[PDB]
Ligand binder design. Structure first.
Ligand SMILES: [Ca+2]
Ligand SMILES: [Ca+2]
Ligand SMILES: [Ca+2]
Ligand SMILES: [Ca+2]
Lengths: 185, 185, 185, 185
């Protein structure tokens, strides 16, 4: 588990195996089964993002992985809060492909963008450019950069190419609450 | 020791084993026993932070680990001066849990925040937001973000979740003197 | 391939072997032969840099490596879009030595600088200093910093020494489209 | 050599072993003996820092290591131009201890500060704070932060403690030409 987590994160880790083991011992005192349900997971985001409405967001993050074990729980927290976005592109594809069918549709992008938008304070909201100030505008822009028609599908190959190649695209799909905020101020 | 330090720091290290070995040879010329007392440790902070009152701070850092050996001494200096705060969350919990009982109480947070505040120059002080300009205000805000009642306790699980998840929380518990300063100017 | 890529990038990687393997499976669904032609490669840049004219640029990048296999394709995308420029100096020499003869001539630098310039929007263009606002001015400045006469040749030794030693030089040869942009605003 | 360099730099490297090997092949075409003299080394700095007077600086850097072999040459270029200063503290001590006797005297600090100052353009010079605008002022401030009397000696232990602990000190001893410049603008 600790080496397994460290193995999956590799460059994104903010912990050593010993520290992961300490966190783990603590986690087990709280969740003796070593599993956390979707409801328990959503509560972490509700408790730590008082100003926003993190429910949809936390559910989508949970979904990207019944329950999550400690490994997935630790990775989820790293994906939403630590590291650079360009190091999480594979995972991000999993977040955007809402139904897990392997391709991202326009409706899926809208779904994720809407949930991310709910993480932003209505205050930070008016600091947004006119062309990206609503879920639908932000989602359309994204679809547009990928050169997609409403009917089209986006594969993992194109998704990684575009997000890596063009930083403008990376900035639009960005899902970490803090980074979405710190790109305006 | 050098591999042992390098092993504990892992990603936070600013030295190679050879350089650690050089520093060590130098350290032994000064402290032949290879041990440094609390009083000797406090003197390093007093000597290098002339403008502040580092005593309480240095004592708490020392405590987080009679004497410290070279390994702990090197780690302590890394914890207070190098790397990114999000990579020191496990250690930070040890710093905040003043009595080492495993949970952080409101009084402990106040204790650490007060010591950190003593590291800031009275000059940089008035550059602080109204809601975080005194030890008690800064400590209350922290307790408030964790959703705690004065009577409550904070576990290591919640501490890591909150500090990692919400950067606002990370900024409030930040203990490195330089970062506390460079977040205002 | 995944370990082979990870081996060549080493510090520049934004992916783990597992993620590279996922991207690969996706790539094969699109290109069953596991090879991508110059024309297919150019299309990625045309599709993701709508505002510029990426043809010459994409051709030079392709050339630095008939077809490219997945490994070279992944590295090419990393070279143009991720990491710090100072970590790509060896590769950059390969990009500038247009004919692959081992030395860079003044005409080669002009060729690459012109292609890079085509990646910049005519809008960002007037934000350029007077002495670097045209391909020929930018190329001359570069040649001048290297202390070269129009007739001279630049070896890989001098190229690495100059670009590493003097950041001014590094900034002038910079080839990543985003960095060229973000150095003005 | 390539693994040996990679071993000494470890975290500071901007090259892979293969790239170091390429640079090496190029270096040998220029210096078949694989050795570079002090005069040859100084010429690199003179050629790439046209606006300054890099002689004293290049000599001190050379000295910190007759001739230098490729390994030392590569490390020297990394020390002066790449990475973060806090990762080069052991080496920096070697740079400041001009006579190699193991302790730094006030005259040695003045010597190095003067050489570094010669790397700054007279233009960037007036952008310097009043208390650090001359070699003697900058050197005195440094000695003062270390709490030293003119007669005193500075050991490697204290040097590392102070430079790591107090970023103000790190900024004053900073020796990379670019960083000295980019700390004003
Ligand atoms: Ca889907
Ligand atoms: Ca306690
Ligand atoms: Ca050529
Ligand atoms: Ca000396």
């Amino acid at each position: 588990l600790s080496k397994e987590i460290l193995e999956e994160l590799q460059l994104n880790t903010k912990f050593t195996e010993e520290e992961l083991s300490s966190w783990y011992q603590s986690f087990l005192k709280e969740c003796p089964s070593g599993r956390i349900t979707r409801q328990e997971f959503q509560t972490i985001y509700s408790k730590f993002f008082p100003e926003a409405d993190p429910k949809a967001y936390a559910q989508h993050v949970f979904r990207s992985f019944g329950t999550l074990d400690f490994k997935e729980y630790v990775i989820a927290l790293h994906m939403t809060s630590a590291g650079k976005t360009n190091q999480k592109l594979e995972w991000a594809f999993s977040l955007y492909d809402v139904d897990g069918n392997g391709t991202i549709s326009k409706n899926e992008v809208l779904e994720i963008v809407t949930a991310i938008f709910k993480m932003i304070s209505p205050e930070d909201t008016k600091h947004l450019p006119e062309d990206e100030n609503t879920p639908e505008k932000r989602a359309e822009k994204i679809w547009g950069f990928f050169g997609k028609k409403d009917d089209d599908k986006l594969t993992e190959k194109e998704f990684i190419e575009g997000t890596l190649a063009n930083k403008e695209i990376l900035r639009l799909i960005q899902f970490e609450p803090q980074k979405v905020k710190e790109k305006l101020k």
